[PDB]
A paper describes a structure:
Diadenosine-5′,5-P1,P4-tetraphosphate (Ap4A) is a ubiquitous second messenger from bacteria to higher eukaryotes, which responds to environmental stresses and cell cycle phases. Ap4A then binds to the histidine triad nucleotide-binding protein 1 (HINT1), thereby disrupting the protein–protein interaction with microphthalmia-associated transcription factor (MITF), and the released MITF eventually promotes the transcription of mast cell activation genes. The HINT1 protein is a compact and symmetric dimer, with two adenosine pockets at opposite sides. Here we report that Ap4A specifically polymerizes HINT1 into (HINT1-Ap4A)n (HAn) filaments in solution and in the activated RBL cells.
Residue numbers in the entry:
A (entry chain A): 13 to 126
B (entry chain B): 12 to 126
The structure:
């Protein structure tokens, strides 16, 4: 349950993380390697390894990650905006094979997005 | 009006041209006019939502649908080595069109940080 990645360990509370929000199906916490003054992740508790293998039934859950992300961003005072990112695979630069939504703010985000 | 006032609303109603990848009752996927990767397209809802920060709770399935369509289009376009999904919110996010949309970029190595 939670999967065999470091994010699984975080979900199971086996290793520490700075948790922002939790409910019965997702978890939001600050990234250990922040790329902006505010940088956190929203992850599902269901182990979906990558967005490319998500099913149609996961539709509401994925949207839930975004809504939680939006709400956490507001709570963290990101009133000038932010960027949401999902990485897939090698080219996408996905670092952990557990689906995660990046939320970055507190500075001007630039273009291209990597 | 169905689709809203932005240029994306006009694309939805076929009033200005677009290179469309996928269309159903809830969304539309089309190629970006200023690609930042060899493949770069957008997935947008047909319902006008100005930005992700004002999305409502019952917009959850719709937002998730954008992602599912995004990943399916990516697969259909042969992005087998991966891709990056992006949502720009507000000034710090660099948002320029205030109709919610998901970027999907691939066909090259994406770098970190993501802007
Ligand atoms: N007529 C158009 N057709 C397709 N893509 C567009 C059009 N106008 C703007 N875009 C793209 O939409 C995005 C809007 O910027 P942003 O709001 O930061 O995502 C940019 O990537 C633009 O290149």
């Amino acid at each position: 349950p939670g999967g065999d990645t470091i994010f699984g360990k975080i979900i199971r509370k086996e290793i520490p993380a700075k948790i922002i929000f939790e409910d019965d199906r997702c978890l939001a916490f600050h990234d250990i390697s922040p790329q902006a003054p505010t940088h956190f992740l929203v992850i599902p508790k269901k182990h979906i390894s990558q967005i490319s293998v998500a099913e149609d039934d996961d539709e509401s859950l994925l949207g839930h990650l975004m809504i939680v992300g939006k709400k956490c961003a507001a709570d963290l005072g990101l009133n000038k905006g932010y960027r949401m990112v999902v990485n897939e695979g090698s080219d996408g630069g996905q670092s952990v094979y557990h689906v995660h939504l990046h939320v970055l703010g507190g500075r001007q985000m630039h273009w291209p997005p990597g």
